[model samples]
Target: QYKTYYTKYIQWCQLNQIIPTPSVPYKDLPISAELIHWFLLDTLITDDEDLDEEEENSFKIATLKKIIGSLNFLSKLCKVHENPNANIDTKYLESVTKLHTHWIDSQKAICPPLLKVSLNLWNPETNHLSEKFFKTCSEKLRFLVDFQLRSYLNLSFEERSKIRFGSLKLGKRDRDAIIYHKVTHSPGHHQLLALLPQDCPFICPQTTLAAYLYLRFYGIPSVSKGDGFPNLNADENGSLLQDIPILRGKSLTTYPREETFSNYYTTVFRYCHLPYKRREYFNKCNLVYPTWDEDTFRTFFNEENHGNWLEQPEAFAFPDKIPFDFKKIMNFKSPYTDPFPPPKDLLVQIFPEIDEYKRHDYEGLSQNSRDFLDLMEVLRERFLSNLPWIYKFFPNHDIFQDPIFGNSDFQSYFNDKTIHSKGSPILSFDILPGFNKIYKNKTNFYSLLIER
Candidate 1:
């Protein structure tokens, strides 16, 4: 009864070896390379034929597909920007998946009309795409994507008939392919300031942090185990154009050392996760960790194709991969908040011309959504304060992000600056640290701040 490409794509990603959701590291099962090899062969065969919707299938094989897809995601996660010959080093970074989920929940609390704003998570590299198109086919801006799909969709249906079927974000377009773009839209990230914890200001003392995430979401995101996040493989062509890699742990996001060089730095950092040393960084920390815990239930495998971590119940959120049921996790409009009702109002602060573009000749309320405007007003400070000081003040080449609402380039710089600048001699925010000890990582900070 339902012929929605949107839902189909989601299901395909969930069932295939595409979407990789996050899980507890090393504690999970190793899914194995043999499993991936098996699925690949089988998918190739089935992909060539056009099976009826009622055809029977193998559940174990299907399950394995999901697992591999997730592993693909994790494998592809690390290794963004690096010059082996260069003097730069890599650092670790904390996970941002939780924050993504948190923002989604806030969206539910504030907007009711956006009931099924299908989570645009999952990034598969399928080339054998469906060849039918139409507009307003599914939800908001649905018409545009819908129209593109149905009208030119059949343009390649017959071509795919000779081969197996699939593909999502970053899909190649030899035949008539469909790519979803936001001509004019604003998500709820900017509007959640009202719900922020104080030290983690609703109104940022700076705007860089907000812009960084905005851009990361737009550019750096990719598709791994597209549904239930899985350990990943290195994605050659990431979700967006410049698919650089970021580290997976805390090393990527932390600011420059106030106390020492080593304190702010970590063992290894990557392109999207690097940090240049600077004392002026300020990441939001309102609803603090209070107790930094590292008890995550993850099982680490040296190889991608070997892991059973996908099906584990403990793993709920993953990176580069948003959760499946958006509404299921974030209860809708119950919060009834509209922090930023106008994207232009927020855009003006970042790109004044964009503000004019949004207003001068923009169409209806739909064309000019009013969701992020008000939220940006408050987060500007927190976002900017969070930008890596080393990147801004030191000798580095990163286009700074305007946290309140910049773009991907800026956010990545912020992360990279932090990652690159993780030069501290020692510092650990782990939960196991001494409780009564002046546990502020002063040892590492002093070493770093005093370093050359």
Candidate 2:
């Protein structure tokens, strides 16, 4: 299996001039240090060879060959050509045992994703927090995030508040902080946001908060976590701040003091478990419910690789490293009772070339594929705001994605002045967030102004 698998990889090497042409013997092939560098880089960066059918075997072969070096170096470069079972020189074998080990350590920096993990939470047996809590934090986070992006305009606050779990609102005192930006998709200082330092809106703050709380919920030493809610004044009542050496200010997202910035500001405050760990961010929540409680068993260790993966009946070790997979958790959808159908009467809202895209027999189309269209429309808004916003005030960046009914750069097909102006109005609405007091976070808004 692995032999056939490496076929393409070897082909890739030959095509790239990394190894001698196919005319040369397999074992006697030569390798360059530069070749090893490139191989390592290529292996780490791409997903071309991650065969799902042979995942385990594929992973092993990929790691083994990259570490083994070139067939030529193993066969002829060494002084003692002692062959392994496969006619591989023992000279190559013997040197590689050392070199391969060296490569593993070297690969750690570029290969294995390095999470700037908690010294207290990451152990071989289990992470410092409960698996349940780790995921809960992420769930709350996704809502606040997708909540702002989607719910801020089209979806009602009634639908959003249920998922936007914690509250970290800007206080009256922080007037010096920047105001929020609608153009560049900036969050307010009190805005519920989380991400990497690069200011890329990759990871959500809710997920980072999950990592922190999992530690504090278990009462780990030197760790007293802050209030889960975000946007309040530091000195305001009920305000608690997260302060862990592992967490520093770098691992969480913070809006500007005055709450103004965009995806491109370059200096916005943000957080990440690992600086470059793409795994930290996800489009959906999938963490399993935790089984941790005070009476439940637990342990801790200093080194990351020290814990064993025994199926402990009751014991959980701190600093665990299990990843929560997608669809593993049962997250509920919004309970707004009404699915906001896409605008059929208005074309300019979703399409400025209103006449060109309208071909709907409302009764037939809505009845024939209403559910599917609703889902598609909902998914589109998952990236954009309501139709009017995209038509009027969407920013110039590529982040605002295309409409479900259009092609690449579709928004560009329309006039920029209407879409780029600051005074554009999509603000008037019935359920937009009136003087309504809200609670529980799992429910929708109940009060609104119905001014005629």
Candidate 3:
């Protein structure tokens, strides 16, 4: 799709004699800021002048933005290929911004006002689902509906599909809140906190999730073996039980395809008497119930407040316990140990001198004098039996099957006669030279060494 747009720009440049000739390859052509600006104006705006208002609007702001993005990508590609004239200067950026702003303002002026549709999807007082659909639907369907609704409101469509049981964590202190660890997006280690609304049992995220889990593993005897929630534990293959997709297709084992959820949403929207056209608009809006105060919702939903929610769970109020018996259903026991440690604590443990160094209380020591590598070797030996656990602690290490180290560097280092003495174990002093060589050659080797 982007390639098509880029090809069009190249064709336009060729036709306009912007580049020397059509015989010149697109990659070899100079892509300057002025050229890009002119190309956008000629193709996106000037070309559409003859069309009616509706036809002109068809080349929407979104389409224009995507075209711009494609141009940017191609320009970067040209730059990578050593084209000096592919630079995207400030003038080009400012011109595009001005174009978009003016285009948006023009569209807004002529566009019809949106219909004010009051969607009471979750409000117990006005919730049509509770009055009509909830009672009639099977327990399985009921659970699915609630789970989908909550997930829909809280996450992007992509994020919703990526959700696995392992990604979910019930707040210990504030039991009403469920923390979703989003692994799919940038700043990957994000936690989205959703508080179970006390007023609506029909739409409660906690009860819905619990019900779904209970139903899925109902008669499975293996579930009883786990001390904590069986869903959270890793299976025999070392995949977390919670790693399984929360939403599944007809087979139960397989995850639902993208269209599956879309179809389900349309079905639900129709059943609830919501305008199908406004379904996406409602989904994008702040769909939280109006009853809950802004401050309370902000505490859980806002990123700034996320820092202490896990550590200082006591700060949030605990909602009243649900009717579901998690103990009977899940055979609940104590929670499992958190795989990753806090950043500060992890740093202190990894580098023992961090505390003293921070306080300026330690004697200045040269890199050669430090026993960091020696300590790591000692720790590895001590935790040899628990290598899998160690791998989890230092996730980036790829300890057992490291790419760079396993392939060449470690083999070379290990084969060095100076590093491996006949009788004595490999010492830090002996390992230092080999380690330094590998570090100098493969700078990325550092991340794979001790990273979490």
Candidate 4:
């Protein structure tokens, strides 16, 4: 509908010499308050001054409002730069609003109110629609309904279509299993973190999401009689399983439009004998039931309780478990490792007091000395292994073959006791430059000292 409105706006622009022709790019089109107001009046009220009076009288005030809205949307959509101050809507908002009100009152035109309808799809006992509707629906349809309800109940329509498999994250907080939905492509990168409902199994979003994933990746056996589900993981799309759209259209690549979900809801409403209504009706019904808020959300999943919720059966599919590994999804890839282990003897040699200090029942050395020796051993081991800083600084240098700390001269200088007894303000060796560089670059070195 916005596209159609945009096309009309382009035609009007071309006819009025606003641009050379419709071939001009929308981003390059010049726009102003006077031009937009005249366009609105001519296109919606007067019908381009060339049409008959009968044709001109057919236009509705509701359509004029929609055209203005579409123009506003187009103005934002075709923004050439980041400076919103130059946008038509920002600069001409007062003009548009005044003209809209004046014309609306003068024409005495009013849009009819939408029909009021109540839908209680969540509660089975109260409505019985959830139980019967789900039982009769196909697996794909069931998934669609679950996905729509879960999203619609929480997010706005614009955020709904952007949901992908990678958007979901399963976690535990206190006694509640939480599903963190990172809304992709949203302005603020908003997150929808909701606790899994333990009381409602029929409308459990966790189970439905898990089952859908399982069905998509791994097909059920013929003996199990589960054949209607989509197997999109096997498709030759070359995309990762997590990257696929959760609510895909027939094409299996593109996500369904908002109208698709609306049609699905209409079908469900007709089948369940519920009134066909908009999201406003459903949202009103949702208010009657409990929803997550700052206080309740915090109380359920906060640092005070600190219990693992994933261990509970109610967190997954409950009695009938779906064989989906939620943890594997949350696990990050491990960092690089050295093929050979660090020399333990070298570590012990660097901090020789560690063994004898323990031999004296951990009382031979002072606490500060023990801590310093422990930190030395730790740094030695870290330098031997594939530490991030080691690879970052010395990418081609093989630590095992040409060890940095294996120089006997440096070892002799470090182990010298006469220098320690002298209590010099500074101790400098030939290898001090390299050691100082490592010490300066490594954040962990300072952190280890602070921890000690």
Candidate 5:
């Protein structure tokens, strides 16, 4: 869709006497610094005498630069770490980069400098997540302490690398440490991946404490439903609500959806054979429900409380009937709402101080509410002090409302306020693909192949 719709860019390429797709594989074409400069200066429409060319040329260039960043336009031109077929040469890519640098540098003459800014907009504080628990210790006691911690907290990145785990990278770099991306293979599709350090002496307990607390909370997905029921079979694409078949002949036709938890386990658990088998595992998966004794099935999954708190109505407000799938639970808060400001159930678990309000109430936010708010502030201030690399994982889908944490810190930049604009400039798309506007580029609004 993008390749076909970017006809304007292609048209611009042609206007400058450059063949947009000269190579046989539609791989490489001439993308000179001259072409980039001409486009920036409005050479695409030389006959428009009514153009506001004189007063707003700088602003025009700025908006144009922003549009380029959003679409990864430069990357499409360069082959830095993009897909192999791009086949862009070093000198050509470098020439394009230099052209961009000059344009941006020239624009900055009246505006602020765009220096040392990383692709990671949140700009996490590495020092907060850095300090060591066993910094001064070694050997036996350390090993014992490490073993104890292993049973408690998840292993830190450093520890995970040292221990045997089949084959994995040793000591992941900062970029690799925070797991934002994962790859899982399909049966036979050709797979494509179309994809910092610090030191501190203060201990910075607020930052450290908040980081540890928040990190542990979000990481706990798919709280076990026990090992008694049959394992679930992979089915369908997006839906997670599987209807469990426990009773027969319309007798149990109206059981709540949470009761379906029994279905995955009692259902047939046949392996999906290679080369795309037609067996959907329906009857095989459904066959064992009659044999499921209540006492035994209850031991594995509590029908009343099947999923984690995030799936509960009173908490993040996920419908109670939905079954537990970790990935689905992660995105359950779509069509966004106030699942955060963190529910009292979630907040109390994270901050026990808030639990006082659970049993007792104080006046004027009851003082209990005030206490919790105060504590939340302490944690917030500390958390923000050092930007967290993992912050990108949590984002507010409502692009209009700026969140307090997560990507909100960089909201203005992403909102194009950095370009001195009001509401996001709605760059139009038409005679293109899907709709009135297909590729908004409003999301993840910036890009660069390499960091400064």
Candidate 6:
């Protein structure tokens, strides 16, 4: 029926319409039982709960191990040397040091503080070349060029060679360090990341603190600077949300953009011709879920709860009566929302052409988006996401809302004043357990993804 309607729509629109509704064609498309996948790529989705013993992350022990892996790599690279298990491949280090000197001269052309990168390259791309960790990391970070581009690399003529050379040159230290610290924690992704030092005396290496600093920027800025989630991302598109606020200072700026995260991650899946869905994939990655503090995310993804949190297949497994796939989308290849080079002009074109469309009013959109946001919000407040999730592995919960933690945060950047001006406004989504009949609305809004 949809296809039939679509066919008729194309014919009639082209004949007597202003603009033909953009859609798939008859022969090139197919209408079948399998539903077309669409992505909710709008906001950043983080772990709904933080620090609480959410049953969903009951097996978080394994995840912490990954964090340990990440830390170990970082510590060794910075020569902070606290990790007992930090795996600094001897052969790798020798190789990186030599390359690091080369990059020092080359990168200085692109960035002046080449020494900073020598000591730390913030989740360097070196991991992409290794097996086990690097194998997955490389595929995840491959930059997918649009076979043909009318624009040159986003660089001036002078910086082009420097960028090109720096990109190609990888020190063993940089490479192994990224794989060691970032890759192990993120099993299937390539992430070039960093952190600013809190104080000179701080025991943890500045690199170890990078994720923490990054998360701090993402969370809402508190009067105490203790509350809220912090997220920064920079990738290849725009949408409802604007770029993440820039972090300011000598080293890092205040509140970075979502694309910062997106660039590394974008490059991760770009080689494979993937999509960029802020709605779906943005918030889905909660580098700072339980708490905006790096320690919190680190603790959360520990060996104590990683299994349940990382990939709890029980809910999606058969016996669980939950009829839908409520499991969080851990890894998605083609986020149908907006992949490849984003259609910047197309998006504006999709918007009403007239500056003032009669129907385009605040109330109409507020009501519409609120309706969708409300259902999900209230359900989360109710803990409905948990029961559905719980029933997956322990399929005995007859209810839809799953059994999980009660500690988590929620927000909507659009009209959501609570998370206003806070780093990246994150919305939490998962289960909806009845709030023990205490709250009026059982649903809570989790930040998914924001596009701008």
Task: Please give the lDDT score for candidate 3.
Answer: 0.38
TM-score of each: 0.20, 0.20, 0.31, 0.29, 0.17, 0.16
Better of 1 and 4 by lDDT: 4
Q: lDDT of model 1 at residue 378? A: 34
Report the lDDT of model 1 for residue 214.
Answer: 35
Name every residue pair that clashes in candidate 5.
Answer: 124-387, 124-388, 125-386, 125-387, 230-265, 267-285, 268-284, 268-285, 362-366, 363-366
Residue-level lDDT of model 6, residues 1-452, one tens digit each, is: 23332343234324332123455332322111101000001111112233343322333323323322433333343344332332333332232223223322232222111111111122223333233322321121111111000011112212211221012111122221111112223324322221111111111122222222222332212222322221111111221112222122122322323344355434433332345443433333222101112443344224354342322212222012110111111010011110121122322221122223223552444332333222222222222212222222223211111121121211111123222324433212211122212211112121110100
lDDT per residue as tens, model 4, 366-407: 443443334333333433332222223223322212243446
lDDT by candidate, in order shown: 0.25, 0.27, 0.38, 0.38, 0.27, 0.23
lDDT of 1 by residue, 196-288 (tens): 111211111122223332332332223211111111122222322122221111132322122332232221111113343322122232221
Q: Candidate 3 regions off by >4 Å?
A: 1-153, 183-189, 219-238, 278-452
Error of 4 at 274 (Å): 1.4
Please provide, for model 5 over 1-452, each residue's C-alpha lDDT reduced to its tens digit, 9 standing for 90 to 100: 34432345555555444453341223443333323333433332122211443235445445444534423454464444343443223442243334334433443332010111111112222122112321111111112222222221223323322321111111112111111121224322111010001111012223333443343223222331211211112222211112322111112222212223123212211111112212321112211101122332233234254342112221221112111111111211111111112223223333343344344433323332343334444454334433321233223211112233324334432333223323454322111111113223433222211211
Candidate 5 minimal-lDDT segment of 10 residues:
192-201
Candidate 4 to truth, TM? 0.29
- Cα displacement (angstroms), candidate 3, residue 420, comes to 80
**For candidate 2, lDDT tens digit of each residue in 1-452?**
44443454455566555445643334543343323323333443223312442354345435656455443343343324433312333342333233333323332322011111211112212232334422233222322343222211122222222222122222112211111211122231111121111011112122223333332222222333433322223212222222211121214433212111122111111222224312222222222212211211122112233233222211211112110110011111110111232334322333222122224443433221332233223233222223333243223212223233244334433333233433533222221111112311212211111110
**Candidate 5 residue-wise lDDT at 136:** 14
Q: Tell me how many residue pairs clash in candidate 3.
A: 1
